[PDB]
Amino acid sequence: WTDAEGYYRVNIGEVLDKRYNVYGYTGQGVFSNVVRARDNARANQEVAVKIIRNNELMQKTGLKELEFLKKLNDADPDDKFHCLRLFRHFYHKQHLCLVFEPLSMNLREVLKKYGKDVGLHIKAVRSYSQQLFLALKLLKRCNILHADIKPDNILVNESKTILKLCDFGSASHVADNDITPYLVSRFYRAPEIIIGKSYDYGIDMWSVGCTLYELYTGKILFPGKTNNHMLKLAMDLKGKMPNKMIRKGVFKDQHFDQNLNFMYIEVDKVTEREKVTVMSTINPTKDLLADLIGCQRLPEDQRKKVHQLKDLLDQILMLDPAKRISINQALQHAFIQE
Ligand SMILES: NC(=O)c1cc2c(-c3ccc(C(=O)NCc4ccccc4N)s3)cccc2s1
Numbered sequence: 389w390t391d392a393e394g395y396y397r398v399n400i401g402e403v404l405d406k407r408y409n410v411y412g413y414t415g416q417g418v419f420s421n422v423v424r425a426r427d428n429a430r431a432n433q434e435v436a437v438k439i440i441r442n443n444e445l446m447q448k449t450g451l452k453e454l455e456f457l458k459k460l461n462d463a464d465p466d467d468k469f470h471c472l473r474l475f476r477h478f479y480h481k482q483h484l485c486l487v488f489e490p491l492s493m494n495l496r497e498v499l500k501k502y503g504k505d506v507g508l509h510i511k512a513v514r515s516y517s518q519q520l521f522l523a524l525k526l527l528k529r530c531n532i533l534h535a536d537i538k539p540d541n542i543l544v545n546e547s548k549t550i551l552k553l554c555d556f557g558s559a560s561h562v563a564d565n566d567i568t569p570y571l572v573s574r575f576y577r578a579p580e581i582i583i584g585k586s587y588d589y590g591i592d593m594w595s596v597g598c599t600l601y602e603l604y605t606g607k608i609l610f611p612g613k614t615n616n617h618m619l620k621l622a623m624d625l626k627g628k629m630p631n632k633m634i635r636k637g638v639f640k641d642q643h644f645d646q647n648l649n650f651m652y653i654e655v656d657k658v659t660e661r662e663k664v665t666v667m668s669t670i671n672p673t674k675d676l677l678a679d680l681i682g683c684q685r686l687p688e689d690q691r692k693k694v695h696q697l698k699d700l701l702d703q704i705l706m707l708d709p710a711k712r713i714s715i716n717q718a719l720q721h722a723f724i725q726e
Contacts, residue, residue, distance in 0.1 A: 584638030
């Protein structure tokens with residue numbers, strides 16, 4: 389039933405828990421594989437089943453995820469705020485299985501199908517931005533950090549009209565803040581995390597900003613190789629991290645010298661070796677507007693919306709979380725409202 393690496397040996401056509409008729413294979417991650425099934429007990433209703441790897445630590449992550457899903461699902465009984473619905477859980481041959489509403493595509497896979505370095509229609513990005521901000525609102529009302537928002541953890545329905553935030557395996561209550569510089573997938577990781585400053589709901593807003601750029605361009609906004617590189621790429625957009633913010637950072641000495649100069653680590657072209665370059669200034673060079681427009685000819689209505697997305701991204705991607713746009717302000721933004 390279980391392979392050497394602890395994954396359940398999915399067979400298409402098999403029944404799980406004497407009720408879930410497995411007809412489709414959806415994918416495999418680090419922590420699980422996911423199938424499509426019909427519920428024999430509920431008029432053959434379509435479900436997704438996530439089968440956690442037979443591993444103590446990963447099973448415990450799965451039980452943690454059940455707790456956060458129950459809290460979010462119970463807090464949103466009419467399902468208005470775009471978080472994945474858990475129906476129930478069961479055990480099958482010692483595997484923890486979570487039964488979800490039937491979604492089978494994440495926004496990474498959508499980007500891969502609908503182009504390469506292409507991106508989605510600006511009308512779709514508008515709609516998806518509103519739905520993501522509604523998810524942030526519920527998270528905040530529930531005092532929850534998702535702490536891993538990225539295209540891979542956003543699911544879409546068949547018609548790709550509705551998205552749901554998924555995978556609460558990295559989630560926490562806002563109080564118990566592990567001072568770790570590795571919270572959130574690196575590309576989507578806010579600068580307050582990296583420098584070791586106090587963080588909150590702002591890390592999820594940051595991650596959504598990174599996601600929205602990627603949804604329209606088809607390109608990762610900040611493809612940094614390390615934490616130091618991530619800061620350089622952030623500061624290429626906004627300029628040097630403010631002095632007040634640097635001095636608060638528990639990890640400031642990994643990134644900045646005594647005079648608050650940035651210590652940029654570069655892998656030398658010639659040698660495969662790291663070197664350091666001290667920079668007192670980082671001049672903003674990241675041209676967001678030019679990035680979003682792909683040297684492409686748009687109708688003026690779409691051109692208006694891309695400028696508005698750019699303004700919204702400028703307000704999301706403030707380095708200081710205290711200066712970052714609120715969920716309320718984001719929902720009321722011209723990009724979504726006009
Ligand atoms: N992480 C989670 O908690 C959940 C994921 C899902 C899904 C999934 C949607 C798509 C998934 C996926 O892994 N595709 C990537 C992939 C894997 C292997 C080979 C190719 C690709 N593209 S999993 C669906 C329903 C519920 C949950 S909960």
